[PDB]
Amino acid sequence: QKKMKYLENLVGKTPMLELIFDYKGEERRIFVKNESYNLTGSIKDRMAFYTLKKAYEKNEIKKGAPIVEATSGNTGIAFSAMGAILGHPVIIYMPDWMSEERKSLIRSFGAKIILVSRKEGGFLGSIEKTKEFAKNNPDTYLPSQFSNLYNSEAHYYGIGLEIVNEMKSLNLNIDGFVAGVGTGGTVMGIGKRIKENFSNAKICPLEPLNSPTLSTGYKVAKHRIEGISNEFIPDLVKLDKLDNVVSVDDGDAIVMAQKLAKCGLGVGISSGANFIGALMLQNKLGKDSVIVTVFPDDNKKYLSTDLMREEKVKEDFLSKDITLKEIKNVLRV
Amino acid sequence: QKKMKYLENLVGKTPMLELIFDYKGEERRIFVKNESYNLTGSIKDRMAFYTLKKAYEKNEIKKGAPIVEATSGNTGIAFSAMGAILGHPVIIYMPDWMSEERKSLIRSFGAKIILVSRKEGGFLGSIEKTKEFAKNNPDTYLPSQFSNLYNSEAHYYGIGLEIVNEMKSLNLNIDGFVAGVGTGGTVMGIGKRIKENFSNAKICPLEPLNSPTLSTGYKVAKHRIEGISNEFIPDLVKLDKLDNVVSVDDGDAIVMAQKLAKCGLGVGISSGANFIGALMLQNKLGKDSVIVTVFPDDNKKYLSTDLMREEKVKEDFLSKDITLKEIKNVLRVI
Numbered sequence: 001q002k003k004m005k006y007l008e009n010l011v012g013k014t015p016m017l018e019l020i021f022d023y024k025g026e027e028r029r030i031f032v033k034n035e036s037y038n039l040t041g042s043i044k045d046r047m048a049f050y051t052l053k054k055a056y057e058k059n060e061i062k063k064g065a066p067i068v069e070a071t072s073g074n075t076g077i078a079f080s081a082m083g084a085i086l087g088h089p090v091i092i093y094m095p096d097w098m099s100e101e102r103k104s105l106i107r108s109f110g111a112k113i114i115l116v117s118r119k120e121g122g123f124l125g126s127i128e129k130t131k132e133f134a135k136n137n138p139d140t141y142l143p144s145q146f147s148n149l150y151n152s153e154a155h156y157y158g159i160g161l162e163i164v165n166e167m168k169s170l171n172l173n174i175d176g177f178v179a180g181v182g183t184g185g186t187v188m189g190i191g192k193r194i195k196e197n198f199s200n201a202k203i204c205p206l207e208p209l210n211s212p213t214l215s216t217g218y219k220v221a222k223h224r225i226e227g228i229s230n231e232f233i234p235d236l237v238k239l240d241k242l243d244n245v246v247s248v249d250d251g252d253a254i255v256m257a258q259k260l261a262k263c264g265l266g267v268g269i270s271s272g273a274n275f276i277g278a279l280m281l282q283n284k285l286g287k288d289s290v291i292v293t294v295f296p297d298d299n300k301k302y303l304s305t306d307l308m309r310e311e312k313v314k315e316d317f318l319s320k321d322i323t324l325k326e327i328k329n330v331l332r333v
Numbered sequence: 334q335k336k337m338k339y340l341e342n343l344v345g346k347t348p349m350l351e352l353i354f355d356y357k358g359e360e361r362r363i364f365v366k367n368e369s370y371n372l373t374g375s376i377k378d379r380m381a382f383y384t385l386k387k388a389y390e391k392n393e394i395k396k397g398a399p400i401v402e403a404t405s406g407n408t409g410i411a412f413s414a415m416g417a418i419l420g421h422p423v424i425i426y427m428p429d430w431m432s433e434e435r436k437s438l439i440r441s442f443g444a445k446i447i448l449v450s451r452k453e454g455g456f457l458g459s460i461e462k463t464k465e466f467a468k469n470n471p472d473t474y475l476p477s478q479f480s481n482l483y484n485s486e487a488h489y490y491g492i493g494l495e496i497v498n499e500m501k502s503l504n505l506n507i508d509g510f511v512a513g514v515g516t517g518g519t520v521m522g523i524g525k526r527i528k529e530n531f532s533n534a535k536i537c538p539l540e541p542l543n544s545p546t547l548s549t550g551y552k553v554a555k556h557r558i559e560g561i562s563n564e565f566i567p568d569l570v571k572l573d574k575l576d577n578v579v580s581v582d583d584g585d586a587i588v589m590a591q592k593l594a595k596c597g598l599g600v601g602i603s604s605g606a607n608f609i610g611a612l613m614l615q616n617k618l619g620k621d622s623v624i625v626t627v628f629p630d631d632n633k634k635y636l637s638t639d640l641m642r643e644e645k646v647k648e649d650f651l652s653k654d655i656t657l658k659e660i661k662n663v664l665r666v667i
């Protein structure tokens with residue numbers, strides 16, 4: 001309680017960057033939150049902390065109860081660290097094709113990690129195994145990130161608020177916001193906050209072009225944008241209450257992430273995707289529209305992946321016409 | 334200059350943690366700066382930013398000039414990122430037995446990474462190659478971290494000042510400070526700041542027991558505490574102006590780092606070493622003495638190392654009598 005007050009100093013309050021770049025070849029800018037500046041290096045720390053703090057406040061978790069979750073990586077890492085801080089055993093189910101770094105990290109935080117193959121049902125299968133564990137261990141706390149409102153609320157109260165306060169400090173109206181969807185907590189929570197302040201802002205969820213599950217409603221394929229598009233549309237995301245889906249090719253996302261690293265911003269693959277997405281929305285709203293996005297994590301968990309290999313440029317990539325020019329401002333509140 | 338003012342928001346202002354633990358039935362606490370909360374994830378971001386900012390101010394670097402450095406990893410990473418932001422090519426020479434993650438990261442930031450074997454002279458060899466590059470290429474900027482006062486100054490003006498302000502806000506006098514030595518910038522700079530505010534504080538440099546270069550003045554051996562004890566005593570560190578050397582076994586450092594990760598603090602190997610060193614100093618000064626240290630980076634670059642394997646506990650390890658109890662406070666002045 002008092003504890004929860006000081007433990008919040010481990011999450012959030014991250015830099016907002018103004019990134020200037022040339023696009024075929026007009027001067028453009030985009031605003032981005034750098035979420036590596038967090039306990040375990042991702043935006044998910046804000047959500048795990050908020051989720052457990054509220055669960056404590058509402059008596060939904062007992063002391064020493066296991067926390068059990070299914071993850072693409074970061075949320076598992078986040079609950080493993082914060083659970084260990086708060087004295088909980090943590091058990092994480094994760095698909096076996098997520099980066100090796102994610103598995104090692106979860107184990108380093110003292111959690112039990114159970115990998116789940118395509119054969120055992122992947123993401124939906126991971127989720128079912130968490131529920132089977134809860135049935136067989138009735139003290140279990142299930143954060144239920146793919147459906148729990150605490151997830152979107154974390155970002156309404158945390159990062160979304162920082163974003164509205166920071167843009168207001170620059171006397172800029174927010175015209176749009178883009179984020180890749182895994183659970184949708186990011187887009188929904190930030191979206192809610194932004195729209196209460198700017199009722200015409202466009203809030204766009206993002207998907208891989210290779211696995212366009214949101215825009216089609218059903219299509220699922222392999223893609224390399226780790227963390228988003230986890231083989232189903234999560235209950236938390238409400239596509240009818242968001243603006244149009246933005247779709248980015250996973251190679252375009254990679255190239256963009258590589259370029260961001262060569263201007264000093266070592267980001268994960270979904271950060272590259274978000275950057276491209278923000279540009280796509282800016283292209284629709286006007287070259288000077290004020291678009292915000294987020295960089296969910298750094299590049300450290302992606303050294304084993306195609307982020308570190310040469311990616312073939314295709315004719316429809318936006319990245320090929322982008323030259324990053326400068327970090328034009330950094331705010332930290 | 335206006336640029337340097339806003340770019341500083343990418344470094345520093347990191348959490349100070351109060352960590353409570355049991356050591357032989359006594360309740361102990363130790364204060365630690367969590368330096369993962371930085372541009373590239375390490376304390377070295379503060380130093381690279383400071384070094385280049387001052388170099389710019391004093392006209393010691395030209396626009397587009399190459400920044401060339403020899404590193405155990407983090408400082409190379411830090412200069413690579415900050416150099417890229419400021420429009421500089423970066424060239425890094427690094428021994429080939431540093432973690433693979435370090436090499437990939439430096440490249441990811443667009444720097445040229447040249448690896449240097451034990452046969453080619455290791456760290457001193459890496460340093461010589463930076464100087465040969467500068468002699469061949471006359472507008473080369475050499476941050477020269479093993480000897481440049483800007484390095485210790487970074488920490489005098491940055492992290493050392495945060496530490497003094499934070500401990501003063503808790504009404505606590507600082508009795509000691511411990512940090513592993515690579516360049517010595519951390520210990521010298523923080524030490525200077527702490528001693529100006531607490532003239533009786535002990536400032537102790539730390540080394541690996543397995544490669545006790547500081548306390549012997551000569552011995553060099555293989556050890557796994559990446560980032561410290563880089564095969565020589567750096568000119569920057571002044572052992573005669575510091576308090577006694579603290580030596581930690583690299584297995585003991587590993588176990589301590591593993592334990593920290595199991596209480597939610599995913600830290601590098603030198604962070605484990607520093608925690609043990611703080612305890613050793615506390616043991617000498619008094620169970621209640623106020624000891625401060627730093628955790629230079631997270632565990633992400635160490636997934637390929639013994640940090641992720643089972644370490645054999647030896648009888649002389651301090652880690653084996655430590656039980657972490659809780660994160661008792663976190664301060665953050667942003």
Ligand SMILES: C=C(/N=C/c1c(COP(=O)(O)O)cnc(C)c1O)C(=O)O
Nearest residue numbers: 071072074075181182183184186227270
């Ligand atoms: C679903 C998860 N992650 C989402 C994620 C996302 C998508 O954010 P939301 O899950 O809040 O939609 C974007 N980028 C990265 C690196 C991510 O790790 C998870 O870690 O379980």
Ligand SMILES: C=C(/N=C/c1c(COP(=O)(O)O)cnc(C)c1O)C(=O)O
Nearest residue numbers: 404405407408514515516517519560603
């Ligand atoms: C010599 C360097 N590293 C220092 C370092 C140190 C030693 O810090 P000082 O250089 O300030 O002594 C401790 N821990 C870690 C993880 C480090 O990377 C360098 O990164 O090149």
